[PDB]
């Protein structure tokens, strides 16, 4: 009767000049799961950066189409993050993950395949049963070789479109009804086949392996036949964030626990979780999403510091941020977007969500803190969910937000 407390680890953040974060910074004693982001497959990545396309090209020399691959092998296998006690033929993050598994044997560690920029190849793989067979077999062989891993996480964004190369708001990337139907059935086949390959591994090693997936909110969830797919799956990581952002003038909560009459389009984590349950995802498998960042706008109109409303708009997304514009890691908000910098902290009790208003500058920031995380964890318990997870760990290097997740979720 222990709940999930999972944290996403981005493989690229060690090279962030302002906020280097590595495996040795993970608060491993306070998590049940670490999810390593991201791996991929030998398939098209035309929508990704040129860097990524070349990395995919290097790993896939010699390999069958749709073979499961490590993409950033420098980060995963070569970078020396320090000596470790385990004797492994590689360095990188993976040597550190092996050491972390040694020192924390009850922790589970999963690789995540896909993510925003590397979902594209799934749409190609899905056209062909043999391609799906190759991905499944090779993904399992990959974790058999890197045997600190405890299963596979899928982050295909998304069957039926709504992703980077599959937007429904552009005629020539919007998917047909026929492709939608095709991908619906492929998702089921994929999870069935992966589950069978993991079962074979179990018969050899006598260990248990998990197979899990990210689930998009609203329509992004409905491209999947959950009644057919759920029996093969361990957890569904509900992506209950990025509800609003710098891509639109619509200003408000990014990751609010509760919908209210003041929500844009009736949005809230609760409403989206309840829809997922209605679609056939058992509540006990679902894991509610928390964010260790926020999003912000400038030139907020018709606003004086009150509660955020269902009509609130700004001139545009903030032309500033922690890295690229419009998003703010939690540590950056604490340090630079506080009282001393002209920002008043405010808490929306009905929504259970914090925000920051700077009345002089007219800047509005929505984010996530100790209080909203505690509220999410408590609501997850009351709603009979599996647990809580965070995107992403490096947003709070103090490990305090994870502390709240763990304490509240396991009480």
Question: DSSP assignment of 295-328, as one string?
Answer: EEEEEE-S-SSS---TT-BEEEE-S--SSSTTEE
DSSP state of 117: T
Task: For domain 4-290+368-409, give the CATH number.
Answer: 3.20.20.80
Q: Note the Cα 10 to chain centre separation in Å.
A: 10
Single out the residue of 75, 81, 209 nearest to residue 140, CA to CA. Answer: 209
Cα–Cα distance for residue pair 361/156, rounded to 1 Å: 39
Cα distance between residue 262 and residue 282, in whole Å: 29
SS3 at position 292: coil
Q: φ and ψ at 330, to 5 degrees?
A: -55, -45
- For residue 39, give every residue at least 6 positions away whose Cβ sits within 8 Å of its Cβ, in sequence order, or none: 68, 69, 70, 71, 111, 112, 113, 142
Phi and psi at 215, nearest 5°, equal -130, 130
Q: After which residues is the chain broken (C to N over 2.5 A)?
A: none
Closest CA to 221 of 273, 291, 182, 260: 273
- Helix ranges restricted to H, 290-341: 330-336
Q: How was this structure determined?
A: X-ray
Give the CA dihedral 33, 38, 44, 46, nearest 10 degrees.
130
Indicate left, alpha or beta for 151 from its phi (over 0: left) and psi (-120 to 50: alpha): left
The angstrom resolution of this structure is 1.7
* Integer Cα distance of 275 and 380 in angstroms: 15
d(CA 8, CA 406): 15
Domain spans of the chain? 4-290+368-409
The alpha helices in 281-339, defined as continuous H runs, are: 330-336
The token duo for 311 is 């009509």
Three-state DSSP state, 363: strand
Q: CB of 135 within 8 A of CB of 67?
A: yes
> How far is C-alpha 246 from the geometric centre of its chain's CA atoms?
19
| C-alpha 263, offset from chain centre | 23
In the DSSP assignment, the letter for residue 3 is: P
CA atoms within 13 Å, Cβ hemisphere of 396: 25
């Amino acid at each position: 009767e222990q709940k999930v407390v999972a944290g996403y680890f981005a493989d690229w953040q060690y090279a962030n000049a302002e906020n280097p974060y590595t495996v040795k910074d993970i608060p491993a004693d306070k998590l049940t799961h670490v999810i390593y982001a991201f791996l991929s497959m030998c398939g098209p990545h035309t929508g990704a950066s040129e860097t990524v396309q070349n990395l995919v090209a290097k790993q896939c020399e010699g390999k069958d189409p749709y073979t499961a691959i490590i993409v950033d092998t420098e980060a995963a296998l070569e970078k020396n993050f320090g000596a470790v006690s385990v004797n492994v033929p590689y360095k990188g993050h993976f040597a550190q993950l092996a050491e972390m598994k040694k020192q924390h044997p009850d922790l589970k560690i999963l690789p995540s395949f896909g993510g925003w920029t590397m979902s594209e190849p799934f749409h190609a793989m899905a056209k062909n049963k043999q391609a799906m067979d190759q991905f499944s077999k090779s993904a399992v062989e990959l974790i058999a070789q890197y045997d600190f891993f405890d299963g596979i996480d899928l982050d295909w964004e998304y069957p039926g479109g709504g992703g980077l190369t599959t937007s429904p708001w552009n005629p020539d990337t919007k998917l047909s009804d026929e492709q939608k139907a095709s991908e619906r059935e492929a998702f089921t086949y994929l999870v069935k086949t992966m589950r069978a390959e993991l079962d074979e591994l179990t018969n050899q090693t006598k260990r248990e392996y998990e197979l899990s997936t990210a689930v998009g909110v609203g329509p992004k969830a409905a491209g999947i036949d959950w009644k057919a797919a759920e029996p093969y799956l361990t957890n569904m990581f509900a992506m209950t964030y990025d509800f609003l952002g710098g891509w639109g003038q619509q200003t408000g909560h990014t990751t609010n626990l509760h919908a209210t009459e003041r929500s844009w389009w009736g949005m809230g984590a609760d409403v989206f979780i309840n829809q997922m349950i209605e679609l056939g995802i058992p509540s006990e498998k679902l894991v509610i999403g928390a964010a260790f960042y926020g999003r912000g706008w400038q030139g907020t109109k018709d606003f004086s510091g009150g509660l955020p409303t269902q009509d609130l708009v700004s001139e545009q997304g903030a032309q500033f941020g922690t890295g690229e514009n419009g998003y703010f890691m939690f540590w950056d908000l604490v340090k630079n977007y506080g009282a001393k910098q002209g920002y008043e902290y405010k808490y929306d009790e009905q929504s259970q969500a914090p925000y920051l208003w700077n009345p002089e500058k007219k800047v509005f920031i929505s984010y996530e803190d100790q209080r909203s995380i505690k509220a999410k964890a408590n609501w997850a318990k009351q709603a009979n969910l599996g647990g809580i997870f965070t995107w992403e760990l490096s947003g709070d290097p103090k490990g305090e937000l994870v502390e709240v997740m763990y304490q509240e979720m396991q009480k």
